[PDB]
Amino acid sequence: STGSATTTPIDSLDDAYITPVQIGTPAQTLNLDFDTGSSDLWVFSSETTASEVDGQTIYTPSKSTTAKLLSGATWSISYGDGSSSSGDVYTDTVSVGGLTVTGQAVESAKKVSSSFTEDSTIDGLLGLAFSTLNTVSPTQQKTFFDNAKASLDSPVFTADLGYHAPGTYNFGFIDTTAYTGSITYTAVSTKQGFWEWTSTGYAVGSGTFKSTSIDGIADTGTTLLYLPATVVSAYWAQVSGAKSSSSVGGYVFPCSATLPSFTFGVGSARIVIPGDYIDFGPISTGSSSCFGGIQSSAGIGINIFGDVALKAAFVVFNGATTPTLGFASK
């Protein structure tokens, strides 16, 4: 089997991407944030505290003839950005772009934190990291990809995120028309439950490539590119007027600037992030100070190749017995 679904930016800044997902019988379509940095599939639902719902589409398990309460199971998750959610668990039929899993754990939110309530465009998350990170207790549950894997033509999924435009998630096949050149594969450690790999270095604009190992995660659920302070300083040093602002919480730059590109290494290959991908617009409405798309990972504890990086590439998440990651230009 295979599946293919279009993924769409939630806003003009590509703050996140949503992908339609069919849940239950008859289908209830929710727009979920596919997140390779976590491993829970959770949804706004008929069980979510009413005051915490503000425009999201909800899953109502009582209206699904295939929904079954998973007895005694609960979940609770806290993300790197301080947001959180929790609730109970159903199993139900879940389909993505034509690919169907029966008995998928669908984690129904009873509580969500303010940032979720405040974002009417995201109806939940679909985790695509390794199932070892799944928070369901007392019996850990598998991700959608883990459940689908054996049935797929090839045990892979691909992320092809657009810049200010739609893109595609494919399951079970590699669309050879979706990228240029070849796909360079690189080793993955699953030891922390993430798609964790080591970049071979970086360049800023037309500058010389610096060979240096950067361990990080491929995370479609993080908006920006978080890298070591030395790397980030080298980037923003090339932008007149850019500075790290403690009050704003990162590097800001004059909105009038033209940003340089940023290149990262995948083996001997190179992925070039155009400067425009690094502009996240005014810090507040009407401001001429703009937020940077490359930020320090210091105090996160891990480097994160988030959407800013991933959207410059066609990315293969290879779930073979020994997982690997593949990157191609596009």
Coordinates of C-alpha atoms in Angstrom, one line a residue:
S1 CA 0.0 0.0 0.0
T2 CA 0.9 3.7 -0.2
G3 CA -0.6 7.0 0.8
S4 CA -0.1 10.6 -0.3
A5 CA -1.5 13.7 1.3
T6 CA -1.0 17.4 0.7
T7 CA 0.4 19.4 3.6
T8 CA -0.4 23.2 3.8
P9 CA 1.1 26.0 5.8
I10 CA -1.2 27.3 8.5
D11 CA -0.4 30.9 7.9
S12 CA 1.7 33.3 5.7
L13 CA 4.9 32.6 7.7
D14 CA 4.8 28.8 7.5
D15 CA 4.6 28.6 11.3
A16 CA 3.4 25.0 10.9
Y17 CA 1.9 22.7 8.4
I18 CA -1.5 20.9 8.5
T19 CA -2.4 17.7 6.7
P20 CA -6.0 16.3 6.5
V21 CA -6.5 13.0 8.3
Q22 CA -9.6 10.8 8.2
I23 CA -10.6 9.3 11.6
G24 CA -13.4 6.9 12.4
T25 CA -16.5 5.6 10.6
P26 CA -18.0 7.5 8.9
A27 CA -14.8 9.5 8.4
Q28 CA -14.2 12.6 10.5
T29 CA -11.6 14.7 8.8
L30 CA -9.2 16.6 11.1
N31 CA -6.2 18.8 10.1
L32 CA -3.2 17.5 12.0
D33 CA 0.3 18.7 12.5
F34 CA 2.6 15.8 11.3
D35 CA 5.4 15.9 13.8
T36 CA 8.6 13.8 13.3
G37 CA 9.7 15.0 16.7
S38 CA 7.0 13.3 18.7
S39 CA 5.1 10.0 18.8
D40 CA 1.5 10.7 19.9
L41 CA -1.5 11.0 17.6
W42 CA -3.8 13.3 19.6
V43 CA -6.9 15.3 18.7
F44 CA -9.2 17.9 19.9
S45 CA -12.4 16.1 20.7
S46 CA -15.9 16.1 22.2
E47 CA -14.1 15.4 25.5
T48 CA -11.9 18.6 25.4
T49 CA -12.7 21.1 28.1
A50 CA -15.1 23.5 26.3
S51 CA -13.4 26.7 27.2
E52 CA -10.2 25.3 25.7
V53 CA -11.8 24.8 22.3
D54 CA -11.8 27.9 20.0
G55 CA -12.5 27.0 16.4
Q56 CA -10.8 23.6 16.0
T57 CA -12.6 20.7 14.4
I58 CA -13.2 18.0 17.0
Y59 CA -13.2 14.2 16.9
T60 CA -16.4 12.7 18.5
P61 CA -15.7 9.1 19.2
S62 CA -19.3 8.3 20.1
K63 CA -20.3 9.0 16.5
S64 CA -17.7 6.6 15.1
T65 CA -18.9 3.0 14.8
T66 CA -15.3 1.7 14.8
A67 CA -14.1 3.7 17.9
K68 CA -13.4 1.7 21.0
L69 CA -12.3 3.1 24.3
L70 CA -8.9 1.7 25.3
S71 CA -9.6 0.7 28.8
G72 CA -7.6 2.4 31.5
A73 CA -5.3 4.2 29.1
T74 CA -4.3 7.8 29.5
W75 CA -1.7 10.1 27.9
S76 CA 0.0 13.4 28.8
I77 CA 2.6 15.2 26.8
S78 CA 4.8 18.3 27.2
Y79 CA 6.6 19.7 24.2
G80 CA 9.9 21.6 24.0
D81 CA 8.1 24.9 23.6
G82 CA 6.2 24.6 26.9
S83 CA 2.9 23.5 25.4
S84 CA 1.0 20.4 26.6
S85 CA -2.1 18.3 26.4
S86 CA -3.6 15.2 28.0
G87 CA -6.5 12.8 28.0
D88 CA -7.8 9.3 27.3
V89 CA -7.4 6.9 24.4
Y90 CA -9.5 5.3 21.7
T91 CA -8.6 2.9 18.9
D92 CA -10.1 3.7 15.6
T93 CA -9.6 3.6 11.8
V94 CA -7.2 6.3 10.6
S95 CA -6.5 7.1 7.0
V96 CA -3.9 9.5 5.4
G97 CA -4.1 10.2 1.7
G98 CA -5.6 6.8 0.9
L99 CA -3.5 4.7 3.4
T100 CA -5.6 3.1 6.1
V101 CA -4.7 1.8 9.6
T102 CA -7.3 0.0 11.7
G103 CA -6.9 -0.1 15.4
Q104 CA -4.8 3.1 15.5
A105 CA -4.5 4.7 19.0
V106 CA -6.3 8.0 18.7
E107 CA -5.5 10.0 21.8
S108 CA -8.5 12.2 22.7
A109 CA -7.7 15.5 24.5
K110 CA -9.4 16.4 27.7
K111 CA -7.0 19.2 28.4
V112 CA -4.9 21.4 26.1
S113 CA -2.6 24.3 26.9
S114 CA -3.3 27.8 25.8
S115 CA -1.1 27.8 22.7
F116 CA -3.2 24.9 21.3
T117 CA -6.5 26.7 22.1
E118 CA -5.2 29.9 20.5
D119 CA -4.4 28.2 17.2
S120 CA -7.7 27.4 15.5
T121 CA -6.0 25.8 12.5
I122 CA -4.4 22.8 14.2
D123 CA -6.9 20.1 15.2
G124 CA -4.2 17.9 16.7
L125 CA -0.8 16.2 16.1
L126 CA 0.2 13.1 14.3
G127 CA 3.6 11.9 15.7
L128 CA 6.1 10.3 13.3
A129 CA 9.1 9.9 15.7
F130 CA 9.8 6.4 17.1
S131 CA 7.1 4.7 19.2
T132 CA 9.4 4.6 22.2
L133 CA 8.5 8.2 22.9
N134 CA 4.7 7.5 22.9
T135 CA 3.2 8.7 26.2
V136 CA 0.2 6.4 26.5
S137 CA 0.1 4.7 29.9
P138 CA 0.1 2.0 31.1
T139 CA 0.5 0.4 27.7
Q140 CA 2.6 2.4 25.2
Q141 CA 1.0 2.7 21.7
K142 CA 2.5 2.7 18.2
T143 CA 2.6 5.6 15.8
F144 CA 0.6 5.6 12.6
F145 CA 3.8 4.9 10.6
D146 CA 4.8 2.0 12.8
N147 CA 1.3 0.5 12.4
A148 CA 1.3 1.0 8.6
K149 CA 4.9 0.0 8.0
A150 CA 4.5 -3.7 7.2
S151 CA 1.7 -3.0 4.7
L152 CA 3.6 -0.3 2.8
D153 CA 5.3 -1.1 -0.5
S154 CA 8.5 0.2 1.1
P155 CA 8.9 1.0 4.8
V156 CA 9.4 4.8 4.3
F157 CA 7.7 8.1 4.4
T158 CA 8.7 11.4 2.8
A159 CA 8.3 15.0 3.8
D160 CA 8.2 17.6 1.0
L161 CA 7.3 20.8 2.7
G162 CA 6.7 23.9 0.7
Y163 CA 7.9 27.5 1.1
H164 CA 4.8 29.7 1.4
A165 CA 3.1 26.9 -0.6
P166 CA 1.6 23.4 -0.2
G167 CA 3.7 20.3 -0.2
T168 CA 3.3 16.6 0.3
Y169 CA 3.7 13.7 2.7
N170 CA 4.0 10.3 1.0
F171 CA 3.9 6.9 2.7
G172 CA 5.4 3.8 1.3
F173 CA 7.1 5.1 -1.9
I174 CA 9.7 7.7 -3.1
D175 CA 8.4 10.0 -5.8
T176 CA 11.4 10.3 -8.0
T177 CA 9.9 13.3 -9.8
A178 CA 9.8 15.4 -6.6
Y179 CA 13.5 16.1 -6.2
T180 CA 16.6 17.0 -8.3
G181 CA 19.9 15.1 -8.3
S182 CA 20.2 12.1 -5.9
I183 CA 19.1 11.4 -2.4
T184 CA 22.0 11.2 0.0
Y185 CA 21.4 8.9 3.0
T186 CA 22.9 9.4 6.4
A187 CA 22.9 7.4 9.6
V188 CA 20.3 7.7 12.3
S189 CA 20.4 7.1 16.0
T190 CA 17.1 6.1 17.6
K191 CA 18.6 6.2 21.1
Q192 CA 16.6 9.3 22.1
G193 CA 13.5 8.2 20.1
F194 CA 14.1 10.9 17.4
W195 CA 15.3 10.9 13.8
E196 CA 18.7 12.0 15.0
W197 CA 21.6 12.4 12.6
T198 CA 24.9 14.3 12.2
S199 CA 25.3 17.1 9.6
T200 CA 28.7 17.4 8.2
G201 CA 28.9 21.2 8.4
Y202 CA 27.6 24.5 7.1
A203 CA 28.1 27.6 5.0
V204 CA 26.7 31.1 5.3
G205 CA 25.7 32.7 2.0
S206 CA 28.6 32.3 -0.6
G207 CA 31.1 31.7 2.2
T208 CA 33.4 28.7 2.5
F209 CA 31.9 25.5 3.9
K210 CA 33.0 24.7 7.5
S211 CA 33.4 21.0 8.0
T212 CA 32.1 20.2 11.5
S213 CA 29.8 17.6 13.0
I214 CA 26.4 18.9 14.1
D215 CA 24.2 16.3 15.8
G216 CA 20.5 17.1 15.5
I217 CA 17.0 15.9 14.8
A218 CA 14.9 16.1 11.7
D219 CA 11.7 17.6 13.2
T220 CA 8.8 18.6 11.0
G221 CA 7.0 19.8 14.1
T222 CA 9.4 22.5 14.9
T223 CA 9.2 25.7 12.8
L224 CA 12.7 27.0 13.0
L225 CA 16.3 25.8 12.6
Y226 CA 18.1 25.6 16.0
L227 CA 21.8 25.2 15.8
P228 CA 24.9 25.8 18.1
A229 CA 25.5 29.3 19.3
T230 CA 28.8 29.6 17.3
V231 CA 27.0 28.6 14.0
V232 CA 24.1 31.0 14.6
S233 CA 26.4 33.9 15.5
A234 CA 28.4 33.3 12.3
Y235 CA 25.1 33.5 10.3
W236 CA 23.6 36.6 11.8
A237 CA 27.0 38.4 11.7
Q238 CA 26.4 38.6 8.0
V239 CA 23.2 40.6 8.4
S240 CA 23.6 44.3 9.1
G241 CA 21.8 45.3 12.3
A242 CA 21.0 41.8 13.4
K243 CA 21.2 41.1 17.1
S244 CA 20.2 38.6 19.8
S245 CA 17.4 40.1 21.8
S246 CA 16.8 38.8 25.3
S247 CA 13.4 40.5 25.5
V248 CA 12.2 39.0 22.2
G249 CA 13.8 35.6 22.8
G250 CA 16.3 35.3 19.9
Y251 CA 17.9 36.9 17.0
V252 CA 16.1 39.7 15.3
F253 CA 17.0 41.7 12.2
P254 CA 15.9 44.8 10.3
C255 CA 12.9 43.8 8.1
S256 CA 14.6 45.8 5.3
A257 CA 17.5 43.3 5.2
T258 CA 18.2 40.8 2.4
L259 CA 19.1 37.6 4.2
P260 CA 21.9 35.4 3.1
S261 CA 21.3 31.7 2.4
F262 CA 22.4 28.9 4.8
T263 CA 23.9 25.7 3.6
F264 CA 24.0 22.5 5.6
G265 CA 25.9 19.3 4.9
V266 CA 24.5 15.8 4.5
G267 CA 27.5 13.6 3.9
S268 CA 29.3 15.1 0.9
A269 CA 26.0 16.7 -0.3
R270 CA 24.8 20.2 0.4
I271 CA 21.3 21.6 1.1
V272 CA 20.9 25.3 0.5
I273 CA 18.2 27.2 2.5
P274 CA 17.4 30.4 0.6
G275 CA 17.7 33.6 2.7
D276 CA 14.0 34.3 2.3
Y277 CA 13.2 31.1 4.2
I278 CA 14.8 32.5 7.3
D279 CA 12.5 35.6 7.5
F280 CA 9.7 35.1 10.0
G281 CA 8.4 38.6 9.8
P282 CA 7.8 41.5 12.2
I283 CA 8.2 40.6 15.9
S284 CA 4.9 42.3 16.6
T285 CA 2.3 43.8 14.2
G286 CA 3.7 46.9 12.5
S287 CA 7.3 46.5 13.8
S288 CA 10.3 46.9 11.5
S289 CA 12.2 44.4 13.5
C290 CA 11.8 40.9 12.1
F291 CA 12.3 37.5 13.8
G292 CA 15.0 35.2 12.5
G293 CA 14.5 31.7 11.3
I294 CA 17.9 30.4 12.6
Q295 CA 18.2 30.5 16.4
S296 CA 20.5 29.1 19.0
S297 CA 19.9 25.7 20.4
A298 CA 21.9 26.6 23.6
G299 CA 19.6 25.6 26.5
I300 CA 17.4 23.4 24.3
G301 CA 19.9 20.6 24.8
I302 CA 19.6 19.4 21.2
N303 CA 20.0 20.9 17.7
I304 CA 16.8 20.8 15.7
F305 CA 16.5 20.7 11.9
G306 CA 13.0 22.1 11.8
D307 CA 10.8 23.3 9.0
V308 CA 13.2 26.1 7.9
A309 CA 15.8 23.4 7.0
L310 CA 13.5 20.6 6.0
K311 CA 11.4 22.7 3.5
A312 CA 14.6 23.3 1.5
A313 CA 14.8 19.5 0.9
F314 CA 13.0 16.4 -0.1
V315 CA 13.4 14.3 3.0
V316 CA 13.2 10.5 3.3
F317 CA 12.4 9.0 6.7
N318 CA 13.6 5.4 6.1
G319 CA 12.1 3.0 8.6
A320 CA 14.0 -0.1 7.5
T321 CA 15.3 -2.4 10.2
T322 CA 18.2 0.1 10.5
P323 CA 16.6 3.5 10.0
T324 CA 18.3 6.2 8.0
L325 CA 17.5 9.7 6.7
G326 CA 17.7 10.8 3.1
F327 CA 18.0 14.4 1.8
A328 CA 17.8 15.7 -1.7
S329 CA 17.6 19.1 -3.2
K330 CA 14.4 20.0 -5.0

